[PDB]
Design an enzyme around this catalytic site. Structure first.
Site, short mmCIF file in Angstrom:
data_model
loop_
_atom_site.label_atom_id
_atom_site.label_comp_id
_atom_site.label_asym_id
_atom_site.label_seq_id
_atom_site.Cartn_x
_atom_site.Cartn_y
_atom_site.Cartn_z
N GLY A 173 -0.58 -1.78 -3.08
CA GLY A 173 -1.92 -1.31 -2.83
C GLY A 173 -2.18 -1.05 -1.35
O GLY A 173 -1.62 -1.71 -0.47
N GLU A 174 -3.05 -0.09 -1.09
CA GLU A 174 -3.44 0.25 0.28
C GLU A 174 -4.76 1.02 0.22
O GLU A 174 -5.16 1.52 -0.83
CB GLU A 174 -2.36 1.07 0.99
N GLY A 207 -7.73 -0.82 5.38
CA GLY A 207 -7.02 -2.08 5.35
C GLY A 207 -5.85 -2.01 4.38
O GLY A 207 -5.52 -0.95 3.84
N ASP A 228 -19.14 4.79 -2.94
CA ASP A 228 -17.86 5.36 -3.36
C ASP A 228 -17.46 4.67 -4.66
O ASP A 228 -17.16 3.47 -4.66
CB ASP A 228 -16.80 5.20 -2.29
CG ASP A 228 -16.74 6.38 -1.35
OD1 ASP A 228 -17.00 7.51 -1.80
OD2 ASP A 228 -16.44 6.17 -0.15
#
Ligand SMILES: Nc1ncnc2c1ncn2[C@@H]1O[C@H](COP(=O)(O)OP(=O)(O)O)[C@@H](O)[C@H]1O
Length: 325
Positions: free
Chosen positions: A62-63, A67, A183
């Site tokens: 994950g990214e 962060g 978002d």
């Protein structure tokens, strides 16, 4: 307490094993003994804090645009067993200002409590003041975008309706305390086990005021291109019902099983000018292929560009539950 003898009695009474708590007559006897025994009239173990020295890495997954997230195990013991956690952390690359936003994000997740939101587990930091690392629970199944392709045929329309329903309650809970997530998409929405979905991070959370029904943005370059309410460019003002369009797009993708190229960015065919002209001309995207009529007929109302025409999440769950029944 601060007295050695009293702490023993309190610890014996407040044991976690319900069959090991002493009888009341023993309590009376001990209290009476303590009374005469002490004529004298007169470091914390807070689990919410973690230290980097005992964090063990296993793998990275994950990214994001603000962060990185990794899987780690915390075990000050002999490293035989522990608890698997997900550690939201910043990165040194251009990290000259992430500290304030990360602190604010930590502040938000400490003041929320609902079933459809990822749990907060604690915080971590280093000696330098920076390097703050959020630690939250780990979901084996990942996000919906990574799950639906893996089980497209095994899933059913019933579970699709359930998943579309559940996130609405979390969004309503968020809107109750005057927050806008700014978002919403498949990558953020998480899924745990089955029939349970919990909302992901809250990095871009901002709070509106009572005297102003919209927020102010100084730089719109960070927002994604096609999850963009028209007011965000026409007036650069953020309204609560703006994410209703986002939820509709997420619903469409949910029915789409996260296809290869049916995403609106891939489906759409100078981007800002084209988007503005299409929004003003009403060039909305059509219904998904093989989609049932009633669900997208209902969803069409919320896609309307006018914020006033958008319905509340309560009305949407009412309609969805009526359709399910
Ligand atoms: N608690 C968690 N358990 C397992 N995976 C997670 C968890 N939180 C985030 N992820 C992973 O993070 C990815 C989504 O990236 P994300 O961290 O939401 O980006 P951003 O940092 O921009 O919010 C997903 O693929 C998901 O697998």
């Amino acid at each position: 307490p601060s007295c050695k003898e009293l702490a023993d009695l309190m610890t014996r009474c407040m044991n976690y094993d319900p069959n090991q708590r002493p009888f009341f007559r023993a309590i009376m006897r001990d209290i009476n003994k303590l009374e005469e025994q002490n004529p004298d009239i007169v470091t914390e173990v807070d689990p919410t804090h973690f230290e980097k020295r005992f964090l063990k890495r296993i793998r990275d997954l994950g990214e994001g645009h603000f962060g990185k997230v990794e899987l780690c195990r915390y075990d000050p013991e002999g490293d035989n067993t522990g608890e698997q956690v997900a550690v939201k952390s910043l990165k040194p690359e251009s990290g000259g200002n992430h500290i304030a936003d990360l602190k604010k994000e930590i502040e938000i997740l400490r003041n929320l409590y609902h079933e459809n939101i990822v749990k907060y587990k604690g915080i971590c930091m280093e000696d330098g003041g920076n390097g703050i690392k959020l630690i939250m629970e780990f979901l084996p199944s990942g996000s919906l975008k990574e799950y639906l392709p893996k089980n497209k045929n095994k899933i059913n329309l019933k579970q699709q309706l359930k998943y579309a329903i559940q996130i609405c309650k979390g969004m309503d809970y968020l809107g109750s305390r005057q927050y806008v997530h700014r978002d919403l998409a498949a990558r953020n929405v998480l899924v745990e086990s089955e029939h349970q979905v919990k909302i992901g991070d809250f990095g871009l959370t901002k709070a509106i005021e009572t005297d102003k029904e919209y927020y102010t943005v100084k730089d719109d370059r960070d927002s994604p291109v096609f999850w963009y309410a028209p007011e965000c460019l026409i007036q650069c003002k953020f309204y609560i019902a703006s994410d209703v369009w986002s939820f509709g797009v997420t619903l469409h993708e949910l029915l789409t099983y996260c296809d290869s190229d049916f995403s609106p960015m891939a489906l759409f065919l100078m981007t800002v000018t084209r988007l503005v002209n299409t929004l003003k001309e009403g060039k909305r995207l059509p219904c998904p292929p093989n989609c049932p009529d009633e669900v997208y007929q209902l969803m069409r109302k919320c896609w309307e560009f006018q914020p006033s025409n958008r319905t509340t999440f309560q009305n949407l769950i009412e309609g969805f539950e009526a359709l399910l029944k």
